[PDB]
Amino acid sequence: IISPEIMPDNKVTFRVYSKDASKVTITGEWQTGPGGVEELVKNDTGMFSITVGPLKPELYAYNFTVDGVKALDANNVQVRRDGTNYQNFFIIPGPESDLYFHKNNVPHGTVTKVWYKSSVIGFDRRMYVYTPAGYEGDTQRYPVFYLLHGAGGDEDAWTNMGRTAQIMDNLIAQGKAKPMIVVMTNGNANQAGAQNEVPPVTGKFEEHLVKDVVPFIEKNFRALTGKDNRAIAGLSMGGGHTQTITNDNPGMFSYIGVFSMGIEKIEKERDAKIEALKKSGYKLYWIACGKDDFVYQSALTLRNTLDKHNFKYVYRESTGGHTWANWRIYLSEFAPMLFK
Amino acid sequence: IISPEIMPDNKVTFRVYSKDASKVTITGEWQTGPGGVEELVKNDTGMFSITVGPLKPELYAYNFTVDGVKALDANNVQVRRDGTNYQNFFIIPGPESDLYFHKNNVPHGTVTKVWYKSSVIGFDRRMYVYTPAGYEGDTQRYPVFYLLHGAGGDEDAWTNMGRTAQIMDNLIAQGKAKPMIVVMTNGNANQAGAQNEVPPVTGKFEEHLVKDVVPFIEKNFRALTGKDNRAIAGLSMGGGHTQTITNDNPGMFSYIGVFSMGIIEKERDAKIEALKKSGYKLYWIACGKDDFVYQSALTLRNTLDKHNFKYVYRESTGGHTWANWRIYLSEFAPMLFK
Structure with missing residues (x-):
């Protein structure tokens, strides 16, 4: 499984596989204030996916939420740490x-x-x-x-x-x-x-x-x-x-x-x-x-x-x-x- | 939320919160093997938990699985990397x-x-x-x-x-x-x-x-x-x-x-x-x-x-x-x- 998959038009596709999960969302730095978290779509064979963008060139951090629980992207080796907050990241060239x-x-x-x-x-x-x-x-x-x-x-x-x-x-x-x-x-x-x-x-x-x-x-x-x-x-x-x-x-x-x-001294x-x-x-x-x-x-x-x-x-x-x-x-x- | 909580007798308690999740398990190096994966128990307030052990002194790595998806313990800052495999860990003194x-x-x-x-x-x-x-x-x-x-x-x-x-x-x-x-x-x-x-x-x-x-x-x-x-x-x-x-x-x-x-x-x-x-x-x-x-x-x-x-x-x-x-x-x- 490829996740994240950065396409030539700077869209990005994220994938999470689970036949038993009912809901997977993604939190990411491209998301604006009003917008917020985005929902992945489940296909009939248990693969969740979403394609976002095109995104401007930048480093973006993100993670998933699986049925209410924070989860990293197991297929992305790039992981940063902000104090106690771990997130994956990727860089749009x-x-x-x-x-x-x-x-x-x-x-x-x-x-x-x-x-x-x-x-x-x-x-x-x-x-x-x-x-x-x-x-x-x-x-x-x-x-x-x-x-x-x-x-x-x-x-x-x-x-x-x-x-x-x-x-x-x-x-x-x-x-x-x-x-x-x-x-x-x-x-x-x-x-x-x-x-x-x-x-x-x-x-x-x-x-x-x-x-x-x-x-x-x-x-x-x-x-x-x-x-x-x-x-x-x-x-x-x-x-x-x-x-x-x-x-x-x-x-x-x-x-x-x-x-x-x-x-005033x-x-x-x-x-x-x-x-x-x-x-x-x-x-x-x-x-x-x-x-x-x-x-x-x-x-x-x-x-x-x-x-x-x-x-x-x-x-x-x-x-x-x-x-x-x-x-x-x-x-x-x-x-x-x-x-x- | 404290997780993992090491007890005086070297038992360890793990906790995860979710009102949506149906099944949460833990995979840890103290376990017998793949068949010895353990399931956390959900309470009415949505907190999943399990207490294991007593464990012998050692460093133990672990992660959760939430309805089929690997999840780290967001309340444990200790994280190791084995190539592509990230896991939490704790050390029993x-x-x-x-x-x-x-x-x-x-x-x-x-x-x-x-x-x-x-x-x-x-x-x-x-x-x-x-x-x-x-x-x-x-x-x-x-x-x-x-x-x-x-x-x-x-x-x-x-x-x-x-x-x-x-x-x-x-x-x-x-x-x-x-x-x-x-x-x-x-x-x-x-x-x-x-x-x-x-x-x-x-x-x-x-x-x-x-x-x-x-x-x-x-x-x-x-x-x-x-x-x-x-x-x-x-x-x-x-x-x-x-x-x-x-x-x-x-x-x-x-x-x-x-x-x-x-x-x-x-x-x-x-x-x-x-x-x-x-x-x-x-x-x-x-x-x-x-x-x-x-x-x-x-x-x-x-x-x-x-x-x-x-x-x-x-x-x-x-x-x-x-x-x-x-x-x-x-x-x-x-x-x-x-």
Whole structure:
């Protein structure tokens, strides 16, 4: 049985076989709000099927519901994990999705799942580190890009949900982004690592990124250093982390990205940190947000605050909302801007 | 909804909610066999449930079947992958399973997913490399253990299905095995990497392990070199790979493990004679009594006996299972480089 079967016109057919099931539906990311879940059709020999689309090029996650129970597609080996939420996925080929594929003619960088001591948090933690193709067997040193996830995620999320390794492999091989080290931390100070592999064990995360993570990377990888060789970005909660880290350490990062995130003694303190950051010598402050994201007005408030300080930034407004589809797009556009 | 719920007497309760489903069963590794599939019982509120056991300490994989369709347990975050087969799992604590847990008071080694060029196979390929805790930030060098999977597997299997990183973390921290680098290759020469992340692209794997993998490891990791610092082991197909590699390259590995695998005619005898004189330190054959390959492994032992070739034989309960392969790894690694 072939499922999903992607046709040349970018329609997709899904199939589930059961003579004993009475109802099979599909939940998928192509489905709009009003529409919702779609029902498969049962043929007389027990095969359920539905054909959707045509779909625009993109990565789409989906799963089934069989007689009220969630079920994955047993004939699709592609499975992602979002915290505790497992789903299948597939990628419609095309211009908009081309960076998300693993290509066989493309040199591939290493993904390292490494543990490090944290003086701030008080126990060892795990992070993922991506190094560019050819890092092994060479003397060259590389700039570093710290990439932060949002609430409910972990250090596995940007590679698993966000296709960071494929995007970076493809951008670098194509000459569109400089070879770089990408450091993906666990942003939940109470965790040691991702909940699917690590059972359980206020500024702690942010402080420990600067005091624990950055020194560890610079000691144990061939990293260029200084703000001009250092980038940081994050989505939602991690976009808040990004602001806090950079506001509290002006002059430490020259490339700053805030994805899908926005904003009297203390009100002066924030103005003062903006002014110190304004004069730090950064090269790029990049704010990206979906028009329909619930945080839209808060990001507009941030943009207006920066305007009032004559703080130079770049704003990328996109369609859609608070989704990994947009965060893949933001990574795809931000990385080619770095270290140039 | 809690599922699975491990009880103090090592019984386990599973739960699934659906008012629509007519029949929900569970398939699990504690079961007698296909006829021993168990059916959950529906209550008036739509919750299906079953309590099983007491179960012996072990890692157990399972899944549900809902009116004929395989379904995972959406309330259990632990999921493994055997090629294309995804299943949930849980671990019953106790003596026989203690090494399989991720423990918070234990230093943890790095797992690296690294690509290398292959002159023999002709395209770049992916392997997993485990380095011991504290490898980073130190200049110490370590011996190397090459660990091979079987048919249907890939470079992700021994860590995913075999809990290698946990077993190695725990064995090393407990002082039972020496700190070592563990290299897990993809043994399918037609593949570049694991099929869940890598699309499709003669003795080629065996040749490329010696000519491509070993130089890459010794150049790009802080590896001790030489036969006394080199171990190799594999299960089923990979246990055949292990025999071919060591028979063809006597004096390259001093620790050899053949898990759940057995055995023109004159070349084999001469290679055994060559290997016998190679100064190896351990030739360890492990196989389950109920394994289909049991007789073939006996033939292998008999052929080594014919040459007065010294080996150590570990006969276990059970058969051709990852439970036994985790056990074999747990017992083989403490024997290495001592």
